[model samples]
Target: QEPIDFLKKEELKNIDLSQMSKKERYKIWKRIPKCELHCHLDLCFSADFFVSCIRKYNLQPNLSDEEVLDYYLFAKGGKSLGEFVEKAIKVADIFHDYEVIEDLAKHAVFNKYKEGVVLMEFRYSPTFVAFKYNLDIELIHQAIVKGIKEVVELLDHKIHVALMCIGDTGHEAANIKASADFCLKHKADFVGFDHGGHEVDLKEYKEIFDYVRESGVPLSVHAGEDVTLPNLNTLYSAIQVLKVERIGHGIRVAESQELIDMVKEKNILLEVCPISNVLLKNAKSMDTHPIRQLYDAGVKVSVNSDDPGMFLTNINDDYEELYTHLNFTLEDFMKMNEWALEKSFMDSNIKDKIKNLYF
Candidate 1:
C-alpha cells in the first residue's frame, strides 16, 4: 500500500545533464504545450499585485510583506488546508474593485501563457466575488466573463475559464444551485464544486453535485487532500452518484487499489497539482508522490499549478520539478499535456484546434 517511486534523487541527478543546457531545457519545456486542469483564481495572486492591493485599500491588517509572504508560502512542508483557505480569502478581500478582478485575470493568464500553458481552466468561488460587489450572481458571472473575454482577445494564447462553487461552510447546495443556474443561463464553458475551510462534513454537498449533474454542466470536486482514505468514498459518490467528470486533487485515492481501479474504469482524470500537494504537505516530499504511481497504473493524471503565486510555483516550474525530481522525459511531459486537454471541458472543435497546434 506504499506509493510507487519512479525516480530517485541520485537517478534524476545522473541524467544526461549535458544533453540539454539550461536555456535548451527551457526551450524544450516551452515548446511542449500544457493544459492546467485545477487552479484557484483568488489563490493565484502575484506578490506585487497583492502588496499593491493592500496599500491601495488602506486596510491595516498589520502584516508586513515578509509576514504576508510567510502567510502564503507553500512547499514540501507548509500550512494545512484550513490555514491555506483562510489566507487565500484574506488576500481576495484586499482587492474589491472590478479593476482588480480584471487585472488579476489578465495577469494570471499572461503568466500562464508565458509558461507555455496553452489551455487553463481557472476556478473561483462566485460567492467570494459577490461579497464585495453586492451584486447578484448573474452580474458576477458577467463581470468575470467580460474580463476573461478581453484577456483572450488581447493575448496570443488560448485560455478556458470555469466557475467553481466552494461549499466548505455547509452552503454547497445553494452555491451549486446559483453557479449551475448562472452557467446554464450564460452557457458557461464548465462548472465545478470545491470545499475549502475543513475537509470534514462534505456529505452535505451531495445534493449540490446532483444538481450540477442534472444541469449537464461538467462536474469536478475537491476531495482526498487533508482527509483520510475513507474520503475516497465521498469522491466515489461524486463520480458514480454525482457523475462528476473529474476529481480535483484526488491524491489520497492513490492509497487504495480499488479506488484507483474504479477511477481508471470510469476514465476520471485526477487533476494532480504536484507542487501544491508538496507545498501543502499532502505528501512528505516529491520522492513519495503518488502521481507517478497513478500514471504508471494506467490512471489518467495531469500536472498543474493549483495556485502558482500562492505556492510560488508556475506551470513551467512545476514541469521543471517533475523533470529534475521525477526524471520525466520530454515525451512523458507531452503525453501529460495531451491527457489534460482530452479531459478538459472545452468544446471538441476547440480541443481539436489546440491539438493540431501541438502536433
Candidate 2:
C-alpha cells in the first residue's frame, strides 16, 4: 500500500509542495485522499518486503537479496540492476504461489486502504508474470481478485479498488488475441487493458488493443517513456490508434505540439512520475521534466508513483518535485484529480460513489 494511496492527488490541488514546511505538508499530504491509475505490482514491493518475499518462497537471488534491493533503490543513489527492464522479467518470477499472490494482494490493498486511497486502478502483466515461471495467468488474476475481495468488508467500501491487465506488446498476433480473450473473461474484476513492456510497433498491436477496447475494456498504454525518437513515435500510435484513456510516461508527447494538441483534443491523461523518470534514467533530472509544461499548456495530467519499490519514491515525492522544480501551485493540483475522476475506467455509478467520497 502507499501513503500516496489515501490522499487523492486531486486533494493536493490547493497545496503547494514547497509552500509548507516538510512536516506541515506531510500532515496534509499524508492524509490527502488519492487515486492511482498506473502501477506495476511486480515492482511495487518495498525492498525489505521484496527481500522478505524472496526468503518466503526460498527464491534465490543472483546477487544477494540485499544486493538486489540496492539496485532497486535507484533514487537513493543505488546502482542500476543491469537493464532494469530486463530485471522486470526476473521480477515476474517471484509470483508463483497463488496463496502468496493473494497475500501480497491483501497487503497491497490494505496498504492503500490504510493510506486512505479512495479509488485505485492498480495494474499488472500476466504475460510478464509468466516469464521464467510458466504459471497459469488465470490463477494469478483470480488470486488478485480474491485478495482485493478479502479487503472490502473489513475496510471501507468507499476505497473502491480495481485491477488492470497489462499486455506485453512484444507478443505476437495470436498471443495478443488470446490476451484479449483473457481480459474479456476476467472483465468483472479488471477495469482496463494496458500495453507496455518495451517499445514495440503500436501499429502491430492496435488491432489487439482495439479488440480489447471493443470488448468494453478501457485501454491505457506506456509510451514516450524514454523520450527517444522511436519511443515518441510509439507514444504517437498509443494515442492516435490504441486511443488510451491514460498514457503511462507519455512525457515526450509534450515535445510535439501536434501531439500535445491531439492529447488535449482527446483528453488523454498523462500519468507523470518525476522521481521514477529520473531514477529509471528516462529523464536526466527532475528540472527537465515536462509535467509542469504540459499542465500549464492545459493538458490533462496527474502525478503518480509508477513503481514505488524500485524508485523508493511515491506520489508525495512526485508532488515535491513538481513543487520544487516547477513551482506547482494549489490551482494546478485542484483540477487534475477531477480529470482523473472523469477519465478513470470505473463504471459511472462507481465513479459517482468514489467522487462523493472525495468532493
Candidate 3:
C-alpha cells in the first residue's frame, strides 16, 4: 500500500487526545517546544501595539484609536483574499518608519517566546518599507536585526530568532531583484530568501531566484495557498524550476498524489498555517483542512501562526486547533517540530544544541 493510504489506518487515529479535556490538551501543547517557520513581521504585532505605535508615531492622526484598530485588524476575519492582502499592504504603510519596525520585531520575538517557541524565523519584505519611505534597504535590515538583538539579548538566546528577507511577488521586477540581492549580499545575516505575496508566475522571478540559489542561499516560496490556477502553477514551478528548500502553505499539494510523491522525494517541508488558511478561505474549515492528510501521507510539515496579530492567534493556538479538530497527539506535535527544526535555515550546530535541549 502507498504511504498516503496510512491516513485511513484505524489504529493511527488520535483516540487518546480525543478523550482528553480541552484544558488538559491545551496545557500539553503549550508546554511542547515549538519551531515557528512562517510568521510575517508586519502582521505579528498585536492590534493594541499597532495602535500605540501609530499614536506614538502620530500616524493616522485623523482616525480614532478604535478606528485604527478596526481598519488594521480583522481578528474575527470575514475578508476575502484580496481584501486581506489590501489590509496587510495598508498596515505596512502605517508602520513604515524605522523605529516602528524595531518595536514590531522586538515584540514579535517576545510574543513567540511567551508561547514557548524556542526557534523562529521572521520573514520581512524590506521592499515594503524601502518603497514606501524611500528608505535604504540596509537601514531597514539593520533596524529589524537591532530589534531582534534587543529582545534576544534580554532572553540570553533562550529563544533563537533569525530573519528571512522576502521579495513580494506583487512588487515590480526591480524591487524583487533588490530584495533578492540584499539577501544574497547578507547571506550570513538572514536565514533564507522567501518569495511571498499574491499570485505571480515564478518564472518571472527566475533571474533573481536563480541568482540567489546559485549563491548558495536557501529559498522558500508562498505557493498552493490561493484557490486559483496560478497558485498550483507557481507551486509546481517552485519545486521543478526554482528548486526551493521549503514551501509556505503548500497545503494544496495534498490534492495530487503525484505532487505529494514529488514533495516527499525532494524532502521539502511545508510550513502549515491553519488559522490563516481558514481566515483567508484557503481551506473550507478547520476540520476540513488537508494538513492531517498531508502529514499522514508522510509529508514533512510544521505548524505556524502566519499572521498571529492579524488573525488573533499564536503558535499554541494553532497546535490546539490541530489537536481539537484534527486530533493530533503529543507525539505528532513532537515529530512535527523535529521535522521543522531539521528543515530550518538555522545553523546545524544550533539545531544540534536545540535537539539536545528540547528533543
TM-score of each: 0.85, 0.88, 0.90
Best by lDDT: 3
Off by over 4 Å in 1: 1-24, 60-64, 72-77, 132-136, 156-176, 189-197, 200-203, 227-231
Worst 10-residue lDDT window for candidate 2 reads: 73-82
Candidate 2, residue 115: how far the Cα is off, in Å = 3.1
For residues 248-324, write the lDDT of model 1, one tens digit per residue: 88888788898899899988989888887777777778888888888888988888888876776677777877787
Clashes of 3: 0
List where candidate 2 sits over 4 angstroms from the true fold: 1-19, 60-65, 71-82, 169-175
lDDT of each structure? 0.68, 0.71, 0.81
List model 3 lDDT by residue over 104-210, tens digit each: 88998998887778889889888766765677778888888999999999988888988898888554333788788889788988888887777566877788888
Compose the digit string of candidate 2's lDDT tens values, residues 76-167: 53223235565565565567678877877777777656544676778877766655556788888878788878787667575787788877
lDDT computed for candidate 1: 0.68
In candidate 2 the C-alpha lDDT for residue 28 amounts to: 61
Q: Which one wins by lDDT: 1 or 2?
A: 2
2 or 3, greater by TM-score: 3
- Cα error, residue 231 of model 1, in Å, equals 4.9
How many clashing residue pairs, candidate 1?
1
Please tell me which predicted candidate would have the highest TM-score against the true structure. 3
